[PDB]
């Protein structure tokens, strides 16, 4: 794929000295960067990865599919309550296939409505057609024949066919109901468009196109005989069986009877209308020759064969062949060949191409194909997952996850991590490592985002990761919130300095109830003690107790000592003396500055104060 880096300013022209182009992939898929190391080339070109989906519709799609994946539970795996586990397994899986189909339809819709580019709509519909066909052929009957469940099958088939292409588009209905050079509606066109409708199961419309021109007119008048045919034929059409393969057995009976009766009877109509009515009855009766004759595309043939001839997939091999002999595969669209492949047994080798259309769809497709047991891990062996060692599906899912991580949409990160966590293969420790490396890139902003991260660190036991994340968060109010060892020590020192200099946080340490609950370390305790001391000071024996507490704190710990000395001087028995002594025993620029600020020599003043205290003790 060739895309223009910038369809505005292209930084090169002639081969004029092939310039050194440089490119760096960014942490965000949609924000990479290119530049050039050359003279007069100082522009920066932000480039986003070719064919990247940033849309909301896409993330919605992704979430929906992850939901289907998650909801599949144990059934997303395939075990190579006895004979029912099999049937019920297929039941739920087959249903999941329908869910995927739906989610993709919705997505495709929202793409057609909110869009700049409709190419995405077309590709997504194609993906849908191919998936409808896949379900119709492997996700309904579970290897059995149509009799096993005539209702569901014909429903999906009829659905698949009438969503693949648009024709017959009502823009073509009026196209012939307008064209003349003939009497009323009786040229190869009307009938071709009537048969087409029948072959596609579009019986309602079929009937309508008849009650449009000569149901009662030309027939009820000209030939009363063929009028009865053309009428109770429309009656049989009105009651084509779609639930009982018995009712169909009898239906084709009445139809073949009608075709024989009319077959040899009163010809009171034009030479052409005669046959034109016979063919219609043959097609309805299931004549192979005719079903092929009035078919525009192979899938019309195939569909017809299943609807009017013999409703057995045991003949699909033959049906497809005849169909392809009549109309070759139309290489205009990308869905026809894949459908042919599906029908003809070779399901595989579609994952790479679907991966080219859309990574996501391909991923989950491979996943459900593994669930069905249509593809499995043949490998049989290096302590990790993202390889060929596990499934092809595991591989594609894990790949999608990783791809989601660079998308920068925090909504999908749960999908990514969940995808990895639920991966049916790989050691819990291997996953542990992968998550340990991905999580740090989570684009958290809210509090909740962070709590989610943490919850995942808990759930997976990544204390070194959580410790790192938090470290990133820590990097006055912020510091208060934070309150590694060195940092705590520094915080302690700061608190002590503040106390020496001397609200809600301080009280909590010593809405409010919630905070107390959250709080429920050494630095913190020290600050609390300092606060208590200050409170006592604000409030003789109390003062002494506070002074004692201060001396004890000083012993546990230069600036602090100076502040203490200052406090003692301001205040200016045996225990007190002992404390003073210990302080003297314990006894740079910042300290001197603090001393100068307090005064607005220190050792001498301290000694003098000590002497005074001793004298006081002696007098007592």
């Amino acid at each position, epitope marked *: 794929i060739l895309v223009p880096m910038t369809v505005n300013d292209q930084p090169i022209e002639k081969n004029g000295d092939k310039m050194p182009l440089k490119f760096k992939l960014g942490p965000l898929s949609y924000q990479n960067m290119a530049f050039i190391t050359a003279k007069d080339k100082y522009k920066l070109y932000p480039v986003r990865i070719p064919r990247l989906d940033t849309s909301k519709e896409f993330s919605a799609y992704v979430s929906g599919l992850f939901e289907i994946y998650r909801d599949l539970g144990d059934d997303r795996v395939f075990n190579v309550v006895n004979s029912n586990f099999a049937k019920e397994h297929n039941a739920t899986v087959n249903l999941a296939m329908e869910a995927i189909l739906n989610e993709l339809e919705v997505f495709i819709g929202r793409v057609k409505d909110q869009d700049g580019r409709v190419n995405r709509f077309y590709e997504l519909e194609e993906s849908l057609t191919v998936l409808n066909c896949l379900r119709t052929m492997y996700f309904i009957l579970d290897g059995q024949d149509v009799e096993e469940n005539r209702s569901e099958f014909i429903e999906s088939l009829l659905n698949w066919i009438n969503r693949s292409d648009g024709e017959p588009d009502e823009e073509y209905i009026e196209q012939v109901f307008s064209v003349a050079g003939k009497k009323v509606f009786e040229t190869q066109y009307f009938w071709k468009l009537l048969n087409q409708l029948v072959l596609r199961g579009l019986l309602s419309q079929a009937i309508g196109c008849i009650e449009r021109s000569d149901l009662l007119p030309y027939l009820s008048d000209t030939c009363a005989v063929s009028f009865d045919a053309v009428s109770d034929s429309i009656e049989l059409l009105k009651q084509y069986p779609k639930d009982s393969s018995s009712t169909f057995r009898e239906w084709k009976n009445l139809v073949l009877k009608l075709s024989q009766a009319f077959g040899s009877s009163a010809t009171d109509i034009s030479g052409e209308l005669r046959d034109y009515i016979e063919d219609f009855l043959l097609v309805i009766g299931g004549n192979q020759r005719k079903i092929l004759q009035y078919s525009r595309t192979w899938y019309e043939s195939f569909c017809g064969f299943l609807l009017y001839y013999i409703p057995s997939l045991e003949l699909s091999a033959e049906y497809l062949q005849m169909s392809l002999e009549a109309n070759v595969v139309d290489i205009t669209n990308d869905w026809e060949q894949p459908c042919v492949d599906i029908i003809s047994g070779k399901i595989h080798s579609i994952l790479p191409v679907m991966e080219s259309l859309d990574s996501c769809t391909a991923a989950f497709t491979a996943m459900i194909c593994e669930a069905k047991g249509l593809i499995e891990n043949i490998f049989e062996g290096l302590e990790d997952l993202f390889s060929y060692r596990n499934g092809m599906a595991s591989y594609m899912l894990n790949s999608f996850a990783f791809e989601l991580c660079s998308l920068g949409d925090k909504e999908l990160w749960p999908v990514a991590i969940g995808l990895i966590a639920l991966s049916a293969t790989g050691t819990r420790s291997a996953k542990k490592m992968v998550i340990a490396e991905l999580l740090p890139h989570y684009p958290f902003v809210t509090n*909740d985002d962070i709590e989610w991260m943490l919850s995942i660190c808990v759930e997976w036991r990544l204390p070194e990761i959580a410790k790192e994340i938090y470290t990133t968060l820590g990097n006055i109010e912020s510091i208060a919130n934070f309150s590694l060892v060195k940092s705590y020590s520094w915080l302690l020192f700061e608190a002590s300095c503040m106390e020496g200099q001397k609200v*809600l946080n301080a009280i909590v340490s010593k*809405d409010d109830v*919630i905070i107390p609950q*959250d709080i429920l370390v050494t630095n913190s305790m020290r600050q609390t003690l300092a606060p208590y001391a200050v409170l006592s000071q604000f409030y003789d024996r109390e003062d002494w107790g506070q002074a004692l507490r201060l001396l004890l704190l000083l012993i546990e710990f230069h600036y602090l000592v100076l502040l203490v000395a200052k406090f003692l001087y301001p205040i200016f028995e045996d225990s007190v003396a002992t404390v003073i002594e210990v302080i003297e025993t314990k006894w740079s620029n910042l300290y001197e500055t603090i001393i100068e600020a307090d005064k607005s020599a220190t050792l001498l003043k301290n000694l003098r104060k000590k002497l005074n205290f001793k004298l006081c003790q002696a007098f007592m």
Partner: antibody
Amino acid sequence: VQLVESGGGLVQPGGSLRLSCAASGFNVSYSSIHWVRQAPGKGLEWVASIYPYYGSTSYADSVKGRFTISADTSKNTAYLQMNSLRAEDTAVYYCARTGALDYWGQGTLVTVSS
Amino acid sequence: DIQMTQSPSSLSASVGDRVTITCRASQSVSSAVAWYQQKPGKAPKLLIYSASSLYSGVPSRFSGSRSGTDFTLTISSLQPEDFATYYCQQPITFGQGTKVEIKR
């Protein structure tokens, strides 16, 4: 991110109403939910709050004994049960949260009369 | 219960003017004071928390400050879209509100 408020309307005096506030986009479990009301042409009046963390609740004097605030963390939904309602209680009622009050309910009008 | 008194209760100012609204707490609350803007018929919107922290996304023309027990909300350059009632907040209690209009 969005608070949603339902269940007000018209109510006879002495009557009762349960207001819901369905939350999303944030941690209900560590947030506080507050109810603040505004009577026609008047200012804002805080009536009640609940801690989803501790379950602690409290009330303005004007509604105490008649209003009960509660919360179900498992559906991210909080409630205000309003009994013995009075003309004085007619107001638009807002739910709001704290982790100041950053996230506000679009409000629902409670009219109380006979 | 704590009372919060806003001054003035009402004001008129031209576009581009600097506007000051003050709020005085009955007792000494701590910087635990928030400012909100309410358009008529709509939920209040947070402007300022912790007295002086600008809530995320709010235009920088709005600022908060404290001097003791006086809290100040300032709008550095008044815009036509700025007409509203503004409330301070510290039971939780709200100030009585200041109505701001455009003069012509």
